[PDB]
Design a protein around this nucleic acid. Structure first.
Ligand SMILES: [Mg+2]
Ligand SMILES: [Mg+2]
Ligand SMILES: [Mg+2]
Ligand SMILES: [Mg+2]
Ligand SMILES: [Mg+2]
Ligand SMILES: [Mg+2]
Ligand SMILES: [Mg+2]
Ligand SMILES: [Mg+2]
Ligand SMILES: [Mg+2]
Ligand SMILES: [Mg+2]
Ligand SMILES: [Mg+2]
Ligand SMILES: [Mg+2]
Ligand SMILES: [Mg+2]
Ligand SMILES: [Mg+2]
Ligand SMILES: [Mg+2]
Ligand SMILES: [Mg+2]
Ligand SMILES: [Mg+2]
Ligand SMILES: [Mg+2]
Ligand SMILES: [Mg+2]
Ligand SMILES: [Mg+2]
Ligand SMILES: [Mg+2]
Ligand SMILES: [Mg+2]
Ligand SMILES: [Mg+2]
Ligand SMILES: [Mg+2]
Ligand SMILES: [Mg+2]
Ligand SMILES: [Mg+2]
Ligand SMILES: [Mg+2]
Ligand SMILES: [Mg+2]
Ligand SMILES: [Mg+2]
Ligand SMILES: [Mg+2]
Ligand SMILES: [Mg+2]
Ligand SMILES: [Mg+2]
Ligand SMILES: [Mg+2]
Ligand SMILES: [Mg+2]
Ligand SMILES: [Mg+2]
Ligand SMILES: [Mg+2]
Ligand SMILES: [Mg+2]
Ligand SMILES: [Mg+2]
Ligand SMILES: [Mg+2]
Ligand SMILES: [Mg+2]
Ligand SMILES: [Mg+2]
Ligand SMILES: [Mg+2]
Ligand SMILES: [Mg+2]
Ligand SMILES: [Mg+2]
Ligand SMILES: [Mg+2]
Ligand SMILES: [Mg+2]
Ligand SMILES: [Mg+2]
Ligand SMILES: [Mg+2]
Ligand SMILES: [Mg+2]
Ligand SMILES: [Mg+2]
Ligand SMILES: [Mg+2]
Ligand SMILES: [Mg+2]
Ligand SMILES: [Mg+2]
Ligand SMILES: [Mg+2]
Ligand SMILES: [Mg+2]
Ligand SMILES: [Mg+2]
Ligand SMILES: [Mg+2]
Ligand SMILES: [Mg+2]
Ligand SMILES: [Mg+2]
Ligand SMILES: [Mg+2]
Ligand SMILES: [Mg+2]
Ligand SMILES: [Mg+2]
Ligand SMILES: [Mg+2]
Ligand SMILES: [Mg+2]
Ligand SMILES: [Mg+2]
Ligand SMILES: [Mg+2]
Ligand SMILES: [Mg+2]
Ligand SMILES: [Mg+2]
Ligand SMILES: [Mg+2]
Ligand SMILES: [Mg+2]
Ligand SMILES: [Mg+2]
Ligand SMILES: [Mg+2]
Ligand SMILES: [Mg+2]
Ligand SMILES: [Mg+2]
Ligand SMILES: [Mg+2]
Ligand SMILES: [Mg+2]
Ligand SMILES: [Mg+2]
Ligand SMILES: [Mg+2]
Ligand SMILES: [Mg+2]
Ligand SMILES: [Mg+2]
Ligand SMILES: [Mg+2]
Ligand SMILES: [Mg+2]
Ligand SMILES: [Mg+2]
Ligand SMILES: [Mg+2]
Ligand SMILES: [Mg+2]
Ligand SMILES: [Mg+2]
Ligand SMILES: [Mg+2]
Ligand SMILES: [Mg+2]
Ligand SMILES: [Mg+2]
Ligand SMILES: [Mg+2]
Ligand SMILES: [Mg+2]
Ligand SMILES: [Mg+2]
Ligand SMILES: [Mg+2]
Ligand SMILES: [Mg+2]
Ligand SMILES: [Mg+2]
Ligand SMILES: [Mg+2]
Ligand SMILES: [Mg+2]
Ligand SMILES: [Mg+2]
Ligand SMILES: [Mg+2]
Ligand SMILES: [Mg+2]
Ligand SMILES: [Mg+2]
Ligand SMILES: [Mg+2]
Ligand SMILES: [Mg+2]
Ligand SMILES: [Mg+2]
Ligand SMILES: [Mg+2]
Ligand SMILES: [Mg+2]
Ligand SMILES: [Mg+2]
Ligand SMILES: [Mg+2]
Ligand SMILES: [Mg+2]
Ligand SMILES: [Mg+2]
Ligand SMILES: [Mg+2]
Ligand SMILES: [Mg+2]
Ligand SMILES: [Mg+2]
Ligand SMILES: [Mg+2]
Ligand SMILES: [Mg+2]
Ligand SMILES: [Mg+2]
Ligand SMILES: [Mg+2]
Ligand SMILES: [Mg+2]
Ligand SMILES: [Mg+2]
Lengths: 96, 99, 82, 122
RNA sequence: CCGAGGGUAGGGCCCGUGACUGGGGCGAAGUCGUAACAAGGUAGCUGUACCGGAAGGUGCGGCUGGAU
RNA sequence: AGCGCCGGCCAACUCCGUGCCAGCAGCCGCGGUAAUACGGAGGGCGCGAGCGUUACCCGGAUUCACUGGGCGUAAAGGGCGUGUAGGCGGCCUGGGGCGUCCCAUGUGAAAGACCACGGCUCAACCGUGGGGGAGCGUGGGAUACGCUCAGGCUAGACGG
RNA sequence: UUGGAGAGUUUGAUCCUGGCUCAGGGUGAACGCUGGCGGCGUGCCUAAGACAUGCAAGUCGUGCGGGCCGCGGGUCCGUGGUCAGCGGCGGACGGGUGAGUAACGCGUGGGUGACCUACCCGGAAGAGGGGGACAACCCGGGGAAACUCGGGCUAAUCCCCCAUGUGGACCCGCCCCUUGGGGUGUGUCCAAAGGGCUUUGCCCGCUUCCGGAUGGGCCCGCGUCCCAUCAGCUAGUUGGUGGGGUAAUGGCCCACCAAGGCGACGACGGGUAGCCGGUCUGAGAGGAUGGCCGGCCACAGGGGCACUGAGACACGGGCCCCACUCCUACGGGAGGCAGCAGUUAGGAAUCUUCCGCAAUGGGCGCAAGCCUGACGGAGCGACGCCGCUUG
RNA sequence: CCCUCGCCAAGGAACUCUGCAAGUUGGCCCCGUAACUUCGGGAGAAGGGGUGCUCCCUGGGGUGAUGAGCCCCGGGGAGCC
């Protein structure tokens, strides 16, 4: 009745924690930054936007995000922030 | 290569899409005779430039929608409403094949 | 990885391998990527071994890994002579 | 308080879904069956190809009731339906699982086989 | 939110079965008659229609695949 | 050493028993007191660690017919018109080259199959080599017939 | 041009039409009567019914820290083994089955400027500096079991932060290119793990990039059975705009907008079937078939779901619902042979609870090696073919 | 005790000649709706969902003047008890 498949399930549970955890933050922040950029609030948007971009590429280092997801996530972030600022402008920090 | 086919536009009642009817001949696999069979392709026309009656070429393309996997390649001839009639008269005849 | 090994053909108590390049995850006697020679362990004919050597060096050159008892039948045909 | 005409849910897998009481087997002239009592019943609704079929006259022990049963310790328990498990002449379920809880009263009345198969006993 | 499924209600197709019932095939050792095959003893056949224990008959119109 | 068969198809014949019985049977048919046709027997024919039966597939079936059938009376012409789709379509000349045809090239895995050789004492089985194909992609080419566009005609058809 | 036989039976007789019938080959066969040997094959076609027991997936101390027994010898140390744990890599292969599916499932040829790919190979560069968790372990609570709850401790190839930027990712501009292909400038963002020897040197690793190789995802043309006594079907339906999602296109999902899409070239519906390489027959054309072997697909008691991951929506992993069965101390809990054998039911009918990792192959490992019901062999059965005997 | 009326545990027609009587159902809006048919119907078949208030956005009509005010018929969103 036993296995080390058990072990393998034991671990999956734990990786799952770190993953979910990581993806939550990425969404929390992009949203936070898109939210700012709508009412922009130019400098602050861009500030958080970097903090997302960091967090994205950081998840992409491992198994959480496939690198293209990171690419895709990042692309859609920047597109949103910028085009939001165009209803008002102008970009306070970097970037870019 | 990407498959290219030539046909008549039979519908433009969609936005940014035309229905292009492609026809083909081939010998019957047993009875020899050359027989025709036709088929409609939904073709991407981002420019809404192709119109009813146009004879056109369409090229197999990366999928645009469910059912749309061809873009219109280029115009070939304009105003073949006589073909569009052929198609339409057949559909219209269907009202007589029921019960 | 892609591998070079022996696919058992022939029959019972009558081996006849084909030195062959296949994906490691194939079955033994499965679809191979390419045949490149054969081997008769019972040695029952003038040429109980043969190898396209020009080829076996390509697959090696591009990363194929031979089995142990294939490495040998590739040495014995001097695909390793430097 | 089950009486002739009362419909009961059947809490087993005999295939009977609903039975209607036709008699309470408790003496010469009992007015009501409660938990642990045996009735005779008609099968009014069953599923296809079970042990039992609509029309069958079977026996069943009442295993939970919508009128609350009171207990010597001053408490009472009440269920959301009236349910009975179909039995044979030796009080053994004719079925092989029993669904939903059952009243502990069944045990003191020698329905051990039913009490054990039950997911819960309240 | 969606969601396995559960429940309620109304539909569609299919299969099994049913008091009784309609003809059908066969069997054949029976009853009744002899409608068709000969001009088959009323030429036949026919669509329809009415009718008769039964094959059938008669009307109307048709065909000859009718003998003399 | 067994099993089927011995009326015809189909290779293999006599005696007894039975008497429209018992029974055989794939089709035609056998048995009602001289049965090569039932049952046994002798003998015979065919196969042989097999022989027979049942089932199913193709075959014979040109009996769904493309190769390769038919419709007065054998089964089979729609009761008759009108006409939609479709299928099919006269003579001459050009353009296009879709069908069609040619060449090249890719693909057409391995096994199997086919030809050669070879290994198990043979074979089956198994190995090495050889030979290709339809079909589809690509490049090039041909233009008679079919197609398509274009221009002529009058024998089809329509009209005065 | 290596290929083509027919016969019986409608009549008193005839010719013709026409059905029935037969001789041939074939099979995963079965039944009867009989039965000696060997070889190669080959054997649940029915209940994708239900299954007792063993076995079918693990490995690494050259990632880490402990326990228990011993070896070496002064409490401590080393060394070996063994046992879990943490950490890898495998477990997505391999093996079974054919239920579902008439579909881009399969076949064949194509497309991806719309994509991914662990371990393998080639080439470019790199490994500085910090901090933390959780088991094992000690301490309590709960059971008959399954087991688990809580308190605290500790290591690492575990986790995180900063540093470093060859490079790589992303927005904007611009050049080539022309669907999202390649290049470039500014801004922003992202690396890491070390272990081992013979120890200023090598081996196995770890990191980011580029290319390769292999394996895949998706897309399109054409082909793929019976019923028209199924003729009409369609509201995520057909298209569009924006977003969501993915590796990636897409009504795959969602909001809004338009009113479209399909159908006698047979939609919709019903029935039946996994498809192919092939197989069997046939002169051929064709018909029939898809068992064994190879390829793809689909499924893992019936259903739904996602997690982990390069890869799964995972046969011997997880969650939930159902059905069934079992266990128990009656409180509770457990299972999924369509893996190999084996039992039972069903059936006209289909095998040993065998042996071995020696060979080929696969997994982990520097290696020794360990695991391997894949496989290699052996057993049963005239089931088939081939060979041989009873002279 | 009778009349008229309100409620009722579990059951739910077992009442009785008979569900007699009383329950149930109940308006409007939307979805949806069978046999059969004289093609009207059967149909309010059946069955089901919605129904208050608050804020924001919004479409058309009447009266005006084309506008404001007034009156009429809507739609979409977010919420509250
Ligand atoms: Mg492990
Ligand atoms: Mg949040
Ligand atoms: Mg992931
Ligand atoms: Mg990644
Ligand atoms: Mg689109
Ligand atoms: Mg009944
Ligand atoms: Mg639902
Ligand atoms: Mg439902
Ligand atoms: Mg449920
Ligand atoms: Mg009768
Ligand atoms: Mg007469
Ligand atoms: Mg007469
Ligand atoms: Mg007469
Ligand atoms: Mg008459
Ligand atoms: Mg009379
Ligand atoms: Mg009369
Ligand atoms: Mg006339
Ligand atoms: Mg014979
Ligand atoms: Mg013969
Ligand atoms: Mg003879
Ligand atoms: Mg006798
Ligand atoms: Mg005699
Ligand atoms: Mg005979
Ligand atoms: Mg005889
Ligand atoms: Mg023999
Ligand atoms: Mg036949
Ligand atoms: Mg013949
Ligand atoms: Mg034929
Ligand atoms: Mg013909
Ligand atoms: Mg004929
Ligand atoms: Mg006529
Ligand atoms: Mg008529
Ligand atoms: Mg015409
Ligand atoms: Mg024409
Ligand atoms: Mg012509
Ligand atoms: Mg051409
Ligand atoms: Mg070719
Ligand atoms: Mg081949
Ligand atoms: Mg050939
Ligand atoms: Mg030889
Ligand atoms: Mg060969
Ligand atoms: Mg010409
Ligand atoms: Mg002309
Ligand atoms: Mg003329
Ligand atoms: Mg006769
Ligand atoms: Mg006659
Ligand atoms: Mg005769
Ligand atoms: Mg004949
Ligand atoms: Mg036998
Ligand atoms: Mg025997
Ligand atoms: Mg054997
Ligand atoms: Mg099976
Ligand atoms: Mg069953
Ligand atoms: Mg069972
Ligand atoms: Mg073992
Ligand atoms: Mg290591
Ligand atoms: Mg060891
Ligand atoms: Mg360990
Ligand atoms: Mg597999
Ligand atoms: Mg196998
Ligand atoms: Mg199947
Ligand atoms: Mg279907
Ligand atoms: Mg298709
Ligand atoms: Mg395809
Ligand atoms: Mg992995
Ligand atoms: Mg520490
Ligand atoms: Mg950093
Ligand atoms: Mg919508
Ligand atoms: Mg889009
Ligand atoms: Mg994925
Ligand atoms: Mg859709
Ligand atoms: Mg079509
Ligand atoms: Mg049809
Ligand atoms: Mg079905
Ligand atoms: Mg099936
Ligand atoms: Mg023939
Ligand atoms: Mg088949
Ligand atoms: Mg079969
Ligand atoms: Mg297979
Ligand atoms: Mg399933
Ligand atoms: Mg499942
Ligand atoms: Mg099962
Ligand atoms: Mg399950
Ligand atoms: Mg698994
Ligand atoms: Mg699973
Ligand atoms: Mg799956
Ligand atoms: Mg698997
Ligand atoms: Mg299993
Ligand atoms: Mg206990
Ligand atoms: Mg539990
Ligand atoms: Mg078990
Ligand atoms: Mg077995
Ligand atoms: Mg049996
Ligand atoms: Mg076997
Ligand atoms: Mg081994
Ligand atoms: Mg090995
Ligand atoms: Mg290794
Ligand atoms: Mg073993
Ligand atoms: Mg009451
Ligand atoms: Mg009540
Ligand atoms: Mg009631
Ligand atoms: Mg009630
Ligand atoms: Mg009564
Ligand atoms: Mg009474
Ligand atoms: Mg009444
Ligand atoms: Mg009343
Ligand atoms: Mg009322
Ligand atoms: Mg009211
Ligand atoms: Mg009322
Ligand atoms: Mg009704
Ligand atoms: Mg009506
Ligand atoms: Mg009525
Ligand atoms: Mg209503
Ligand atoms: Mg209502
Ligand atoms: Mg009010
Ligand atoms: Mg409300
Ligand atoms: Mg209020
Ligand atoms: Mg007024
Ligand atoms: Mg106004």
């Amino acid at each position: 009745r036993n296995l080390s498949a058990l072990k393998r399930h034991r671990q999956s549970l734990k990786r799952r924690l770190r993953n979910k955890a990581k993806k939550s933050a990425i969404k929390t922040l992009s949203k936070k930054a898109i939210q700012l950029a709508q009412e922009g609030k130019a400098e602050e948007a861009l500030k958080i936007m970097r903090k997302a971009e960091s967090l994205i590429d950081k998840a992409a280092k491992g198994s959480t995000l496939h690198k293209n997801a990171a690419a895709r996530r990042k692309s859609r972030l920047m597109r949103k922030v910028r085009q939001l600022l165009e209803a008002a402008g102008a970009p306070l920090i970097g970037g870019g | 290569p990407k498959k290219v086919l030539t046909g008549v536009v039979v519908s433009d009642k969609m936005q940014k899409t035309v229905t292009v009817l492609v026809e083909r001949q081939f010998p019957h696999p047993l009875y020899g005779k050359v027989i025709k069979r036709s088929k409609k392709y939904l073709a991407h026309d981002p420019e809404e430039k192709y119109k009813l009656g146009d004879v056109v070429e369409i090229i197999e393309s990366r999928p645009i929608s469910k059912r749309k996997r061809f873009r219109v390649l280029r115009l070939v001839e304009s105003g073949r409403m006589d073909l569009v009639e052929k198609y339409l008269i057949r559909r219209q005849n269907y009202e007589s094949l029921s019960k | 990885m892609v591998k070079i090994r022996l696919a058992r053909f022939g029959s019972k108590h009558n081996p006849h391998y084909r030195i062959v390049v296949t994906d490691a995850r194939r079955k033994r006697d499965g679809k191979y990527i390419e045949k490149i020679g054969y081997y008769d362990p019972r040695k029952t004919t003038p040429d109980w071994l043969k190898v396209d050597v020009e080829r076996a060096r390509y697959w090696l050159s591009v990363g194929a890994q031979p089995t142990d008892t294939a490495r040998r039948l590739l040495r014995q045909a001097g695909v390793f002579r430097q | 308080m089950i009486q002739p005409q009362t419909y009961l849910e059947v809490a087993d897998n005999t295939g009977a879904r609903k039975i209607m009481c036709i008699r309470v087997l408790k003496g010469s002239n009992a007015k009501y069956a409660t938990v642990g009592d045996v009735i005779v019943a008609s099968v009014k609704e069953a599923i296809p190809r079970g042990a039992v079929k609509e029309g069958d006259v079977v026996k069943a022990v009442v295993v939970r009731t919508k009128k609350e049963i009171k207990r010597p310790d001053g408490s009472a328990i009440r269920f959301d339906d009236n349910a009975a498990v179909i039995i044979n002449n030796q009080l053994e379920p004719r079925g092989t699982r029993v669904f939903g809880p059952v009243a502990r009263e069944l045990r003191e009345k020698g329905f051990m086989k039913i009490v054990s198969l039950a997911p819960e006993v309240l």
